[PDB]
From a paper:
AusE (Mr 35,100 protein, 314 amino acids) and PrhA (Mr 35,121 protein, 314 amino acids) are very similar (~78% amino acid sequence identity) αKG oxygenases that both accept preaustinoid A1 (5) as a substrate to form divergent products through dynamic skeletal rearrangement. Non-heme iron and α-ketoglutarate (αKG; also called 2-oxoglutarate)-dependent dioxygenases are widely distributed in nature, and play a major role in diversifying the molecular scaffold. This superfamily of enzymes employs αKG as a co-substrate and Fe(II) as a cofactor to couple substrate oxidation to concomitant decarboxylation of αKG to form succinate and CO2. AusE first desaturates at C1–C2 to form preaustinoid A2 (6), followed by rearrangement leading to the formation of the spiro-lactone in preaustinoid A3 (7). In contrast, PrhA first desaturates at C5–C6 to form berkeleyone B, followed by rearrangement of the A/B-ring to form the cycloheptadiene moiety in berkeleydione.
To understand the structural basis for the expanded catalytic functions of the PrhA mutants, we also solved the X-ray crystal structures of PrhA-V150L/A232S mutant in complex with Fe(II), αKG, and its substrate (3, 5, 6, or 7) at 2.25–2.3 Å resolution, as well as PrhA-V150L/A232S/M241V mutant in complex with Fe(II), αKG, and 3 at 2.35 Å resolution. Similarly, PrhA-V150L/A232S mutant completely lost its original activity, and instead catalyzed the AusE-type “spiro-lactone formation” to yield 7 as a single product. On the other hand, AusE and PrhA-V150L/A232S mutant first abstracts C-2 hydrogen atom to desaturate the A-ring to form 6. Here A232S mutation pushes C-3 and C-2 toward the iron center through a hydrogen bond with the C-3 carbonyl of 5 to facilitate the abstraction of H-2. The steady-state enzyme kinetics analysis using 5 revealed that the two double mutants, PrhA-V150L/A232S and AusE-L150V/S232A, have similar kcat and KM values to those of the wild-type enzymes. Further, the binding positions of the four substrates do not change significantly and the D-ring region of the substrates is fixed by the same hydrogen bonding network.
Numbering used by the authors:
A (entry chain B): -3 to 36, 40 to 81, 83 to 122, 124 to 198, 200 to 219, 221 to 269, 280 to 295
B (entry chain A): -2 to 0, 2 to 63, 65 to 273, 275 to 295
The structure:
């Protein structure tokens, strides 16, 4: 008795506590392409730390169909928030990444693509898209292809259906053909059943194959999010973290986090040697 | 020609003064093309000389094995060779050809360096296993010949490439087979039945090869011939390089690069359009070359 008996049931979107087993969350990730992780205070210290840089972002009102139309985005999160000390060291984050990406005896098969705070000003709904469209050939491999990208999308201010929270399409990672989602390329355009995604500090772990998009935003609510995009070791990051994150901060990171930001190798080597030698990190 | 004698596969040859369009058409037909005089004889000789000290401090590895040993590999070419960083990577024919492969309309350079590797095959080095270079990106074969290009290689003769000294063995038109598998006994049904052809080249000649082309370094059946090559490996802007050039190449040398050379090594971003635009390998909305100081 989850929907009134006889009702059409909407797409399934499982929810796990931040204390749940990694293999339990992972089976739900494979089943639907996305899961919620409730509980993934630290969220408050972070928002306050990033709030000044947020305030120095002017808003554009363009009615252009762009993703910048009344949506604020900021990436220098390691520079701006002592995040770089607590948030990225989730032993469950790595627990999941290592199940999605790593192979036995290659160590870490993953690293960071971006660390982005997204704040939808009260803004047209984002176009529906797969994240893996960032690597434009991936869709051509269809649902049999390997994962390139997963996203720990974390709520900062709460996610109402009013402030424009992300609308996810669970199960779109198993559709036979992966297309652009528009009226010309997507036969299912307009019949696509979305499910809106949430309280601060909770994260939904989404595959790069799942259709989704930010909805329309209210009068007062700036709905703020924090995206942890993590990609295959073989793919290139959107952010050049090891060129803009200062060496002072890289020295305080763990071996595994230096790898996530490319201050360390596992690809991205230095003539047969780990790049961390030449940088002075033993 | 040969005498009813079987005729081995055709590897096309062009001079470096041929138009990029004629070379590219042959590249598309066959997946590989020789560009003669890709580098001048005087440039190759100066490059060979400028890296030779580094090439002499590299110990030859000999092992008890089928593991691509007795092959020196050196990648600090920008640091060690002014002829390389000031002249070789500024080949316009190289960039002309890279655009025809990689660059989408209105998104700038679609490509950057994966590696710059001197490969010196020692006397007696065993032959390499037949392989496609895009096996580096393990999912790529699964898109088969319809797939987009992962990488191309400008593989230049620094010293002569002969059949005896281990010039690369190529399989022209293997970029067009219907199934791309690893080349082993379990997965490849033509295993042991694959016809190769060597890349016979003088110094400064190069071949240009798709990642979809099966190939392998031959066996060096000489006693005194160290067969040297310079591999300029070039990948799509969305793929990760094997060398972290922006972290080991010094900024002194970065400031003396053209903007397109800076982009090749990750000292500068390229802008991909998806509705939306995004500087790839950027800095929170801006080109990374601002924070690095390159303007
Ligand atoms: C330009 C855009 C790209 C190409 C990349 C994308 C991306 C890195 C990719 C999806 C992912 O996995 O991670 C996150 C959530 C961090 C996003 C963050 C936002 C941007 C930078 C982007 C944008 O801001 O447009 C001006 C978009 O909104 C979007 C979805 O259209 C894109 O595909
Ligand atoms: O802003 C959101 O809620 C979704 C983020 C997203 O999908 C993107 O920008 O890529
Ligand atoms: O050295 C050669 O001729 C071939 C080298 C090669 O193909 C490789 O190392 O990938
Ligand atoms: Fe998205
Ligand atoms: Fe090769």
């Amino acid at each position: 008795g989850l929907v009134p008996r006889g009702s059409h049931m909407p797409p399934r979107l499982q929810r796990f506590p931040a204390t749940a087993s990694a293999d339990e969350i992972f089976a739900a990730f494979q089943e639907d392409g996305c899961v919620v992780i409730e509980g993934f205070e630290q969220v408050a210290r972070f928002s306050q730390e990033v709030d000044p840089a947020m305030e120095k972002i002017p808003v554009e009102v363009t009615n252009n169909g762009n993703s910048n139309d009344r949506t604020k985005r900021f990436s220098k999160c390691v520079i701006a928030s002592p995040f770089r000390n607590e948030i990225i060291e989730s032993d469950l984050m790595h627990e999941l990444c290592d199940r999605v990406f790593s192979k036995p005896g290659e160590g870490m098969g993953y690293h960071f693509n971006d660390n982005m705070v997204i704040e939808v000003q009260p803004a047209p709904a984002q176009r529906l898209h797969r994240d893996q469209e960032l690597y434009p050939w991936w869709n051509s491999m269809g649902p049999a292809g390997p994962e390139c990208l997963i996203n720990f999308f974390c709520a900062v201010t709460p996610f109402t259906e009013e402030n424009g929270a992300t609308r996810l399409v669970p199960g779109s990672h198993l559709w036979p053909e992966f297309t652009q989602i528009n009226e010309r390329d997507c036969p299912q355009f307009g019949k696509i059943e979305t499910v809106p995604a949430m309280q601060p500090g909770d994260c939904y772990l989404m595959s790069g194959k799942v259709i989704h998009g930010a909805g329309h935003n209210t009068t007062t609510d700036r709905r703020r999010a924090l995206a942890l995009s993590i990609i295959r070791r073989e793919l290139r990051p959107m952010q050049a973290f090891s060129l803009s994150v200062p060496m002072k901060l890289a020295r305080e990171m763990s071996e595994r986090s230096q790898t996530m930001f490319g201050f360390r190798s596992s690809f991205w080597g230095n003539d047969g040697k780990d790049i961390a030698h030449h940088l002075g990190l033993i």
